[PDB]
Write an enzyme that holds these catalytic residues in place. Structure first.
Site, mmCIF file in Angstrom:
data_model
loop_
_atom_site.group_PDB
_atom_site.id
_atom_site.type_symbol
_atom_site.label_atom_id
_atom_site.label_comp_id
_atom_site.label_asym_id
_atom_site.label_seq_id
_atom_site.Cartn_x
_atom_site.Cartn_y
_atom_site.Cartn_z
ATOM 1 N N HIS A 144 85.668 46.089 46.960
ATOM 2 C CA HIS A 144 85.649 44.698 46.528
ATOM 3 C C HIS A 144 85.981 44.536 45.048
ATOM 4 O O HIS A 144 85.766 43.453 44.492
ATOM 5 C CB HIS A 144 84.298 44.054 46.859
ATOM 6 C CG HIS A 144 83.164 44.518 46.000
ATOM 7 N ND1 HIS A 144 82.133 45.292 46.488
ATOM 8 C CD2 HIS A 144 82.875 44.287 44.697
ATOM 9 C CE1 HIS A 144 81.273 45.539 45.517
ATOM 10 N NE2 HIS A 144 81.699 44.939 44.419
ATOM 11 N N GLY A 158 77.838 44.478 38.364
ATOM 12 C CA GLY A 158 78.639 45.473 37.685
ATOM 13 C C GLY A 158 78.188 46.892 37.965
ATOM 14 O O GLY A 158 78.872 47.830 37.618
ATOM 15 N N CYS A 195 78.105 48.306 40.888
ATOM 16 C CA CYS A 195 78.863 48.869 42.002
ATOM 17 C C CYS A 195 79.766 50.013 41.573
ATOM 18 O O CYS A 195 80.386 49.979 40.528
ATOM 19 C CB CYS A 195 79.716 47.806 42.657
ATOM 20 S SG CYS A 195 78.732 46.655 43.571
HETATM 21 C C1 LIG Z 1 73.314 39.997 45.574
HETATM 22 C C2 LIG Z 1 74.257 38.963 46.244
HETATM 23 C C3 LIG Z 1 73.420 37.784 46.807
HETATM 24 C C4 LIG Z 1 75.261 38.453 45.202
HETATM 25 C C5 LIG Z 1 75.086 39.627 47.361
HETATM 26 N N1 LIG Z 1 74.299 40.060 48.445
HETATM 27 C C6 LIG Z 1 74.839 39.858 49.785
HETATM 28 O O1 LIG Z 1 75.892 39.341 49.948
HETATM 29 C C7 LIG Z 1 73.993 40.335 50.971
HETATM 30 F F1 LIG Z 1 72.939 39.496 51.102
HETATM 31 F F2 LIG Z 1 74.742 40.349 52.100
HETATM 32 F F3 LIG Z 1 73.527 41.580 50.712
HETATM 33 C C8 LIG Z 1 75.805 40.852 46.753
HETATM 34 O O2 LIG Z 1 75.206 41.774 46.330
HETATM 35 N N2 LIG Z 1 77.297 40.889 46.685
HETATM 36 C C9 LIG Z 1 78.437 39.860 47.106
HETATM 37 C C10 LIG Z 1 79.610 40.701 47.244
HETATM 38 C C11 LIG Z 1 79.426 41.981 46.673
HETATM 39 C C12 LIG Z 1 78.138 42.065 46.041
HETATM 40 C C13 LIG Z 1 77.829 42.386 44.556
HETATM 41 O O3 LIG Z 1 77.657 41.494 43.813
HETATM 42 N N3 LIG Z 1 77.680 43.754 44.095
HETATM 43 C C14 LIG Z 1 77.341 43.949 42.699
HETATM 44 C C15 LIG Z 1 78.418 44.753 41.990
HETATM 45 N N4 LIG Z 1 78.189 45.144 40.822
HETATM 46 C C16 LIG Z 1 75.996 44.680 42.675
HETATM 47 C C17 LIG Z 1 74.786 43.721 42.658
HETATM 48 C C18 LIG Z 1 74.784 42.415 42.184
HETATM 49 C C19 LIG Z 1 73.494 41.947 42.352
HETATM 50 N N5 LIG Z 1 72.757 42.902 42.882
HETATM 51 C C20 LIG Z 1 73.485 43.988 43.088
HETATM 52 O O4 LIG Z 1 73.089 45.002 43.557
HETATM 53 C C21 LIG Z 1 79.970 41.852 47.954
HETATM 54 C C22 LIG Z 1 79.009 42.156 49.131
HETATM 55 C C23 LIG Z 1 81.478 42.168 48.075
HETATM 56 CL CL LIG Z 2 79.275 42.445 35.696
#
Ligand SMILES: CC(C)(C)[C@H](NC(=O)C(F)(F)F)C(=O)N1C[C@H]2[C@@H]([C@H]1C(=O)N[C@H](C=N)CC1CCNC1=O)C2(C)C
Ligand SMILES: [Cl-]
Ligand SMILES: CC(C)(C)[C@H](NC(=O)C(F)(F)F)C(=O)N1C[C@H]2[C@@H]([C@H]1C(=O)N[C@H](C=N)CC1CCNC1=O)C2(C)C
Ligand SMILES: [Cl-]
Ligand SMILES: [Cl-]
Ligand SMILES: [Cl-]
Ligand SMILES: [Cl-]
Ligand SMILES: [Cl-]
Ligand SMILES: [Cl-]
Ligand SMILES: [Cl-]
Ligand code: NA
Ligand code: NA
Ligand code: NA
Ligand code: NA
Ligand code: NA
Ligand code: NA
Ligand code: NA
Ligand code: NA
Ligand code: NA
Ligand code: NA
Lengths: 305, 305
Positions: free
Chosen positions: A41, A143, A145
C-alpha cells in the site's frame, strides 16, 4: 539472575532498513541482497486505501516511481513485482550489510522482536507474540509499515513478520515476508475485527519456570495432575489446550529445574482457580503468556548471537 | 497505538562489543576508537574477588596479558591503565564502527537500554531504570560484565552504565563509563546490601499519560490537587517526592493530552488510596515507574535514530 522482556539485538536488521517513497506515501522497506521488500500500500493514496486495486495501481507505476533511500544514498530501482501483499523492488546495488537470513511463517504463541521504524530509520525494539487470534499487540504509528518482526539463531536472522495495519481494539495485523497475512485480514481500510483471543498456556508455564529459576517459588505445591484434568480446568478460563507437543517443548525447562511439567500444571491449575492471593510473580500481578520456553532458556542461560 | 517496554536500537552498540580475556577470566569490553573499556575485575581470579587489590593485580600484568577479540580478529594491546573500576586497554587499531558517542552519568529515575552480552557477543536488549537506591533491576548472568547501558539521541550514543555485580536481592549494580559506581557499592565479593527503594513518581505519571494517549481513561477524575497535597499522600506509599522540576519535565505530555499535571496527580492520588478496583492500565494491574516522560513521547510520537 533477573528476568526481563528481552528482544534480540537488532543490529543485523538495522542494516537492512530503507525508506520507500511512492508518490506522496513514505514507508519502510527491507533491503536484502538486491531486493527491497515493502508493504504494497505504499502505492496507495489516502483515498485509495478504502477499496484499493493494488494490481491496477501497480500497472500505472514504473521503476523510477519508487524512491528508495539507504541513509543518504538513493537506490536505483530496476524491477518491481507484487507477491500477495508485499512489493519486491529490485535495485541495481546489493546490500553489503545483508546478513544470513530466512523467510519463515511463525505459529500462534511464538514470539519475535519488532524493530519499529519510521522513514527507514529505527525508533526502537520490543518483544511481541503472535496471539492465537493471529493478531499481535504492538506499538505502531502511521509510517511504521514495513517494520519487521524477527528471531535470531546464531548468525541467521529469521524474518517472520511485516507490519501493515492496526485493528480497532488497538492490536496490529501484518503478513509474513511473502505477503501472506496472519489471519483472515486484508490490507484495506474497512470494518475488520479480530476474533476472541486466548491465553497461551505453554508460555505461561514457561514463565512460571523462569520464576522458579529466579527464586519465585510460593506458587509451587506438592500436587500433580494429568493433561486431561488440567485442560478441563484451563478451558473455562479461556486458556489454550495443552497438547503433548507443548509438554515435550517444556522438557528442557523441566529437566533443568527438576520440576515435572505436570507438577507445574498443578501449580497453574491452583493459580487459575484461587488467583494469586495478593502475591506477585517476577514482579507481575498477572500471568504472562508472551515468553516461549526458548525465550526462558535463552535468557536464563545467556545464549548469544 | 499501543505501548511497550521499548529499547533503543542496539546496532551502534553491537559494533563496539569485544571479548576481553585476562588469564582465565573472560568478560566483555567496549571498543570505542582505539580504546577498550572493560570492568577491572577481568584481572581477578575466583579467589581474588573476595579482597582484591586491583592496583597490585594490574602491576603483574603486561599489555600482552590482555586478549581482546573483535569477532575473529585479535586486537593488539599497546597500553593499559585503570580509571576507578574500569580498565582502559589501548589497542593499535581504531574501531571503524565507532559511532558518535558520549560518556554521561545518569540520575536516579532515568532509563536506558542494556545490551546484555557474553563472550563479547550480544544476547539481547531490554529497558532498565536507575532505581532511587542506585541499583538497577537486570537480567545478568556470570560473564555478563562489561555489558553496557545506553541512550540514543539522533546519531549520538550516550553510554551511561557498565555492569559489574549482582546484589543478594536479585538486583544489579554497576558504574558509569568512567569506572565510578552508582551508589555506595564496591567491586568485591563481600556482604553488600541495597538500600530501601522507592517508586519513581514522575515516571508513574508519565506512564499514566501514555495510558490516556492509548485510550485507558477510567482512572481520570474531575478533581485537582496541589503539589504539597499530593506529596503528603504519596510519601506514605513510599513514592518519590514530586518536585517542580518533575512538573516542568511533564509539561510536553500535559500539553499534548490537554490534561494538567496536577490533574493527573489527582488521579494518581486516588489510585494510591483506593487501589485499582480490579481494573488494569495498559494491561498492567500494577503501577509502572520505569517510563520517563521522554520514553513516552519518543514511543507515542515515533522518534527515530
Ligand atoms: C488504523 C486504521 C483505522 C487507519 C486502519 N485500520 C484498518 O483499516 C483495519 F481496521 F482494517 F485494521 C489502518 O491501519 N490502515 C488503512 C490502510 C493501511 C493502514 C495504515 O495506516 N498502516 C500504517 C502505516 N504506517 C500503520 C498504522 C497506522 C495506525 N496504526 C498503525 O498501525 C491500509 C490497511 C492499506
Ligand atoms: Cl507517516
Ligand atoms: C553475584 C555474586 C554473589 C557472585 C557477587 N555479588 C556480590 O559480591 C555483592 F553481593 F557484593 F553484590 C557478584 O556479582 N560478583 C563477585 C565479584 C564480581 C561479581 C560477578 O560475578 N560479576 C559477574 C560477571 N560476569 C556478573 C554476575 C554474576 C552473577 N550475577 C551477575 O550479575 C565482583 C564483585 C568482582
Ligand atoms: Cl521489561
Ligand atoms: Cl524451589
Ligand atoms: Cl499462605
Ligand atoms: Cl513489553
Ligand atoms: Cl562466565
Ligand atoms: Cl480522555
Ligand atoms: Cl465505577
Ligand atoms: Na528475579
Ligand atoms: Na466507487
Ligand atoms: Na538467503
Ligand atoms: Na473504526
Ligand atoms: Na528447582
Ligand atoms: Na493500547
Ligand atoms: Na588474607
Ligand atoms: Na567522542
Ligand atoms: Na550471599
Ligand atoms: Na486527551
Amino acid at each position: 539472575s533477573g528476568f526481563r522482556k528481552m528482544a534480540f539485538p537488532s543490529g543485523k536488521v538495522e542494516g537492512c532498513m530503507v525508506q520507500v517513497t511512492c508518490g506522496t506515501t513514505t514507508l519502510n522497506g527491507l533491503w536484502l541482497d538486491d531486493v527491497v521488500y515493502c508493504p504494497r500500500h505504499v502505492i496507495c493514496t489516502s483515498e485509495d486505501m478504502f477499496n484499493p486495486n493494488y494490481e491496477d495501481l501497480l500497472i500505472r507505476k514504473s521503476n523510477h516511481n519508487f524512491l528508495v533511500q539507504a541513509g543518504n544514498v538513493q537506490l536505483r530501482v530496476i524491477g518491481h513485482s507484487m507477491q500477495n501483499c508485499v512489493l519486491k523492488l529490485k535495485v541495481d546495488t546489493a546490500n553489503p550489510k545483508t546478513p544470513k537470513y530466512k523467510f519463515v511463517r511463525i505459529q500462534p504463541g511464538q514470539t519475535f522482536s519488532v524493530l519499529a521504524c519510521y522513514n527507514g530509520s529505527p525508533s526502537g525494539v520490543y518483544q511481541c507474540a503472535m496471539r492465537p487470534n493471529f493478531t499481535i499487540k504492538g506499538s505502531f504509528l502511521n509510517g511504521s509499515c514495513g517494520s519487521v518482526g524477527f528471531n535470531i539463531d546464531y548468525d541467521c536472522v529469521s524474518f517472520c513478520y511485516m507490519h501493515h495495519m492496526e485493528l480497532p481494539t488497538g492490536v496490529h495485523a501484518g503478513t509474513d515476508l511473502e505477503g501472506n497475512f496472519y489471519g483472515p485480514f486484508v490490507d484495506r481500510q474497512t470494518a475488520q475485527a479480530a476474533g476472541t483471543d486466548t491465553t497461551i498456556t505453554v508460555n505461561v508455564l514457561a514463565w512460571l519456570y523462569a520464576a522458579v529459576i529466579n527464586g519465585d517459588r510460593w506458587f509451587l505445591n506438592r500436587f500433580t495432575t494429568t493433561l486431561n484434568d488440567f485442560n478441563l480446568v484451563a478451558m473455562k478460563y479461556n486458556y489454550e489446550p495443552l497438547t503433548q507437543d507443548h509438554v515435550d517443548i517444556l522438557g528442557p525447562l523441566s529437566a533443568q529445574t527438576g520440576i515435572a511439567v505436570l507438577d507445574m500444571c498443578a501449580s497453574l491449575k491452583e493459580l487459575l482457580q484461587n488467583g494469586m492471593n495478593g502475591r506477585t510473580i517476577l514482579g507481575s500481578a498477572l500471568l504472562e503468556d508472551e515468553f516461549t520456553p526458548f525465550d526462558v532458556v535463552r535468557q536464563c542461560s545467556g545464549v548469544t548471537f
